[PDB]
Amino acid sequence: VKFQVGDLVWSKVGTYPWWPCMVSSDPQLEVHTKINTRGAREYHVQFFSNQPERAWVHEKRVREYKGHKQYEELLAEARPQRERAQWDIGIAHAEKALKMTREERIEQYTFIYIDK
């Protein structure tokens, strides 16, 4: 295990670009990390955006978030207006969270879950 609940990460999910995320615990499974049927590690993340989004991401697609500027380093290794706007909001939220401790990030950004 490389990450804990509240840690800031970059995540590549589907066709979305590398997105700023916070590692969190799955509301149903009650785990933030698990081992696949193939034996690979996965993490549960929550995307930084205006609208809440979450996903179980493979270890190879989860990177440590050090700052917005390292996005060019990730793009070097390897969009709609509505999505671009949400990414800019997400980057602003991740930059504020970098100035906080893991414990503070949990109290401020963890999604509110309703059984409905």
Cα pseudo-dihedral 79, 94, 7, 14, rounded to 10:
-10
CA atoms within 13 A on the CB side of 61: 18
User: Helix or strand or coil: residue 67?
Assistant: coil
Spatial distance between the Cα atoms of 3 and 89, rounded to a whole number of angstroms: 23
Q: How many CB atoms lie within 10 A of CB 70?
A: 14
Which technique was used to obtain these atomic coordinates? X-ray
CA atoms within 13 A on the CB side of 96: 12
43, 56 Cβ separation under 8 angstroms: yes
Structural domain spans, the chain: 1-116
